[PDB]
Amino acid sequence: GNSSIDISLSLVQFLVSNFVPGGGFLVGLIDFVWGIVGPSQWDAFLVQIEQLINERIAEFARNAAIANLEGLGNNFNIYVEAFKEWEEDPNNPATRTRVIDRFRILDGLLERDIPSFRISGFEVPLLSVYAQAANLHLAILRDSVIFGERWGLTTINVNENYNRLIRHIDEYADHCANTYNRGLNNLPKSTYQDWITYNRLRRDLTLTVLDIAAFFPNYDNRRYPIQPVGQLTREVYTDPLINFNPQLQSVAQLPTFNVMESSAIRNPHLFDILNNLTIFTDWFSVGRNFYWGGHRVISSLIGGGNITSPIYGREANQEPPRSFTFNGPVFRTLSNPTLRLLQQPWPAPPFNLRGVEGVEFSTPTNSFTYRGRGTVDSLTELPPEDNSVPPREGYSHRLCHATFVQRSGTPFLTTGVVFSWTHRSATLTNTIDPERINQIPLVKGFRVWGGTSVITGPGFTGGDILRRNTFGDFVSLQVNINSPITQRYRLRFRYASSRDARVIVLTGQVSVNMPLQKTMEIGENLTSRTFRYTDFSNPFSFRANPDIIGISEQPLFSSGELYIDKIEIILADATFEAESDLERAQKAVNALFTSSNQIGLKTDVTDYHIDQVSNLVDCLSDEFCLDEKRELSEKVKHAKRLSDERNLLQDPNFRGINRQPDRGWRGSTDITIQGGDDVFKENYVTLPGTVDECYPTYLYQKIDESKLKAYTRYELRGYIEDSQDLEIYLIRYNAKHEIVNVPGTGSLWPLSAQSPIGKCGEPNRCAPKCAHHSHHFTLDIDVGCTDLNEDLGVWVIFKIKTQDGHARLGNLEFLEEKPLLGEALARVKRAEKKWRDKREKLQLETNIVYKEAKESVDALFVNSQYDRLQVDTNIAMIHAADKRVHRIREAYLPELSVIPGVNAAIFEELEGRIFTAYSLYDARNVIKNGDFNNGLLCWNVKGHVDVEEQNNHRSVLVIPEWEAEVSQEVRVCPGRGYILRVTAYKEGYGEGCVTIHEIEDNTDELKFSNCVYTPLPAGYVTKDLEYFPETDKVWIEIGETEGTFIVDSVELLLMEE
Ligand SMILES: [Ca+2]
Ligand SMILES: [Zn+2]
């Protein structure tokens, strides 16, 4: 029943041009199909396929299918009557009730009857009636979604029907494509006859099934709110122009299946247009028989160049070549394929000559005649889509290409031509209509970039698709714009992907930068469910008319495959973009709070995240959403204030670093604060490196005990723009320490559809193996008991000790996380116990150490006013007392030595007295710079000497050459007594010597032997003598005989008694 083709093509043209809801659409379904097909026409739908697969549907199932289709027709006709009555009078309670009732009956029948059109074992011969019923079902379900509330269905019922509709779109599409593939696969594939049958089944099922199924997604009214116009880009092939009757003639004289399929059918390709056909004429001498012996095809791409074929067949010259530049669509071929039988003598059979002797090609304005016209009419196989006009206007298909097949042997010569055709709905330009959703298959481009493949479509897309296995350029496509070029458009893709990807669209340059979500697992087959839609893009304008679109895939910042079917283009003003942006902002803000009452903030929502959401709200439209924007703005500010209230850090935005000695932040002085950058919309801190590890860059604060709760976990969190050698500590019972290296991220390079830098260089807030790749950090600490007397608190410390270290950070918070349970609780109990036990042990040790140090310091002085040294106090005794003071432990924190520990006060008391002793010692000494704390000043030097530091508080003279001498002239009181005292060490052999003398004699000396640039001694010897000058000047001379001599100090003291 070839009337099924005529019906199908007429319906398809209706779906192309008139895909709109309402009475008009339903009346169309009646006028084209359901009101004019009766039982004998349904029978013909089945016969067409039964005849090809050579199997009749079993009678029980066959009769049932036809009776069911009659029932559907009757019930749909009644539904359309009720719908029309309702449409003309929609507030009438009786028309509303009736349309609901008729809808329910028909929906119920389709649910019950669709299984009867896919009986196991007869899916293929039932497939064209299945597609009819499927199409009808999606149509009436769509009606219930769009109109159901107005009819009087509930919102619940409407949303449930929507869910059913979109599930059925996939189910029905899949059945159509799968069953198509099954039918082809089940056929024999050896002979020419097998091939004829196969290609017939492929063509007929394309026209009566696949072409209809291609429209099923358009019934999703939420995806297609505005009228869509579809295009079928697939190529179909008419029967070979070869005269053959299988009843009479041997298939042995015709090309085999594999030769036909490999020779006659094109591999997947970009959509093309027949430009020029050049035909070569050969002959067969006996009987003077001319025929089409070969040809060359020139084709064009939309907005690109020409494509040339090699010679098909032979470049024969028995008549001149005929070259036809059609300059228009060929809608009809009238062809003359002949069989000529040349007699041979008994008992040889006749020679069989098969060839094309003539073809007339018709365009709407011209005809082109290759030799002569024949009676094989393309219109028989590919009839008009509209019979209300002549074929030159109403044609369904245009000629695309021609291939050539041949077989020769004994005694025969077979040549033939095969024509391919494209459907009328595949337009010869890619035109954008502002009143439509414009559907443009990527196969309608003009350039496939390197590494992109055109592949056979899965069956439900109406044509072929594009694939890439890695990131790269897909296609370039030309578009014509049927509007002023200042109108704004939005675009989306229908795609399938086993990876998350990013797609860029260039016009004219980066117009769209769109994320593509994974739609399927690695390995999964391409079913209807795997094809999804993106959101519509940001608006853009075309730069010219026509314009060129380039599509490229890029890394989200290689896995699986990316397929793209089509791009869809809508006028921006036909959408509600500002409202869509508002609704997303609303969800983001709502997610901040614990509940819908919005009284409390979620613990796991970060301060930094709140700042990010505020940018969403701030980027909303002032033009359309001002009241709603203001209200959302209030909520996000409330969320921020809640973040501020739970933050236990003082001065979280760095307004008062070093303002107070005992509170808020303390920091080293080369830290800087800036008001914000690309990453931060708050004050943030830059920590530089340091030239010396003993003077680290630091920033710290104490959290007071009063702010803490017992048996509770706290977290420090924040955001790091970049860092190297950043150390973070949290300290209570012990120190928790991490080193955080965060590489920088890019902002300028990433190909920008929107700029990251604005006017005046302000940030645009509206623009999108051991390394700590995450910019977020979190560190927790567990509090056991609390005790305000002890006031342990928690120390927060950031430190950098390296030259090249650095950090930029902000959005710091310190917050309560959760109560402790289980092992965490047990652990903090053990940690607090251990901390107490160690503190007790430290106290006992400290009592002993302190008393020893104090007694040793006190002994340096005459009394407890600490204003006068004992005469017998020498420098070595001061250093020895000092060594006892430094035995005190935990005077400062090991993690950062500027922070006092528990024993700071007693260390500082005693150290202070040490420093008093040094100061008094200097004041008493009649020798200038006798302790070498000022280097060599006030000494006369001959030869090479050095002054060096030693722990803790010492400077020493080193004499490494015996020819070196150090001297000073000293004014003294004649007739008074003086003590000379030297603290020194002799390294190696020889003696060290300190000489004192007057202008004339009175020589005395102190000598040092080792026997009882430089690593310094652990201990020194002290010696003294009494000296009695007669004049008012002495010389003090330091030297040695050999080796090295190290002198801590020389003192000359007046005996005040
Ligand atoms: Ca010294
Ligand atoms: Zn000291």
Side-chain angles (χ1 to χ4, degrees), residues 619-632:
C619 300
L620 296 169
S621 175
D622 286 344
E623 174 180 14
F624 288 126
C625 292
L626 185 54
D627 289 293
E628 302 87 357
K629 173 175 186 178
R630 173 179 52 75
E631 286 164 359
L632 275 185

Side-chain angles (χ1 to χ4, degrees), residues 76 125 150 248 351 469 498 597 672 844 897 1008:
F76 177 53
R150 278 166 284 168
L248 286 173
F351 190 103
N469 69 326
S498 43
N597 62 29
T672 52
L844 291 167
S897 60
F1008 291 84

Side-chain angles (χ1 to χ4, degrees), residues 701-727:
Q701 177 183 150
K702 191 181 175 190
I703 314 289
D704 195 69
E705 196 74 356
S706 64
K707 289 181 201 312
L708 302 177
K709 300 174 199 203
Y711 298 114
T712 296
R713 181 163 286 180
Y714 286 85
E715 318 162 69
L716 178 73
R717 317 189 282 226
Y719 195 94
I720 298 167
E721 174 173 356
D722 55 349
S723 67
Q724 182 63 66
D725 312 322
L726 179 64
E727 301 185 55

Side-chain angles (χ1 to χ4, degrees), residues 871-919:
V871 182
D872 205 288
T873 294
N874 69 53
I875 201 54
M877 293 162 60
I878 305 173
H879 299 316
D882 184 67
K883 180 187 179 85
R884 298 182 185 275
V885 173
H886 290 251
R887 286 188 62 196
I888 293 164
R889 284 188 306 111
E890 286 184 44
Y892 300 94
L893 292 203
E895 295 81 9
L896 188 72
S897 60
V898 298
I899 299 174
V902 298
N903 282 334
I906 60 170
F907 172 83
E908 279 159 27
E909 183 193 19
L910 293 189
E911 184 80 317
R913 311 267 185 58
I914 293 299
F915 281 139
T916 307
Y918 286 135
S919 166

Side-chain angles (χ1 to χ4, degrees), residues 566-747:
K566 60 192 176 193
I567 194 177
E568 297 183 339
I569 298 174
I570 198 170
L571 188 72
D573 294 317
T575 66
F576 299 106
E577 175 148 14
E579 299 80 345
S580 166
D581 288 344
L582 178 65
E583 294 179 10
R584 290 166 210 294
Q586 290 175 340
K587 296 196 203 197
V589 165
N590 292 340
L592 300 179
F593 299 96
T594 65
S595 74
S596 53
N597 62 29
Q598 306 194 332
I599 295 167
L601 203 62
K602 289 172 158 126
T603 308
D604 65 350
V605 167
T606 65
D607 189 67
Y608 172 87
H609 184 62
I610 295 163
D611 282 11
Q612 290 303 288
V613 172
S614 71
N615 295 330
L616 278 180
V617 172
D618 288 342
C619 300
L620 296 169
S621 175
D622 286 344
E623 174 180 14
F624 288 126
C625 292
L626 185 54
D627 289 293
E628 302 87 357
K629 173 175 186 178
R630 173 179 52 75
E631 286 164 359
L632 275 185
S633 185
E634 293 287 9
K635 295 180 184 209
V636 72
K637 294 178 190 180
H638 168 55
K640 190 64 186 193
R641 293 191 297 273
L642 288 171
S643 180
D644 299 337
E645 285 186 351
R646 65 181 184 189
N647 192 351
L648 298 185
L649 288 173
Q650 301 297 108
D651 192 26
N653 298 128
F654 312 118
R655 315 205 190 265
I657 306 173
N658 299 337
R659 282 198 81 179
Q660 298 192 99
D662 59 338
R663 185 190 307 233
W665 294 110
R666 302 294 307 178
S668 61
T669 53
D670 202 43
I671 288 167
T672 52
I673 308 89
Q674 288 186 58
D677 72 358
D678 191 71
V679 171
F680 297 109
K681 64 172 298 181
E682 306 298 344
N683 292 338
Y684 70 95
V685 287
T686 298
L687 274 47
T690 179
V691 299
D692 184 333
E693 189 191 12
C694 297
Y695 297 89
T697 297
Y698 64 84
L699 176 64
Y700 72 86
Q701 177 183 150
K702 191 181 175 190
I703 314 289
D704 195 69
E705 196 74 356
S706 64
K707 289 181 201 312
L708 302 177
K709 300 174 199 203
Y711 298 114
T712 296
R713 181 163 286 180
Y714 286 85
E715 318 162 69
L716 178 73
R717 317 189 282 226
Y719 195 94
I720 298 167
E721 174 173 356
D722 55 349
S723 67
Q724 182 63 66
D725 312 322
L726 179 64
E727 301 185 55
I728 303 171
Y729 299 81
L730 291 172
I731 306 181
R732 180 178 177 84
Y733 308 112
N734 52 49
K736 191 167 302 187
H737 168 230
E738 282 202 0
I739 307 175
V740 178
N741 299 312
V742 177
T745 300
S747 287

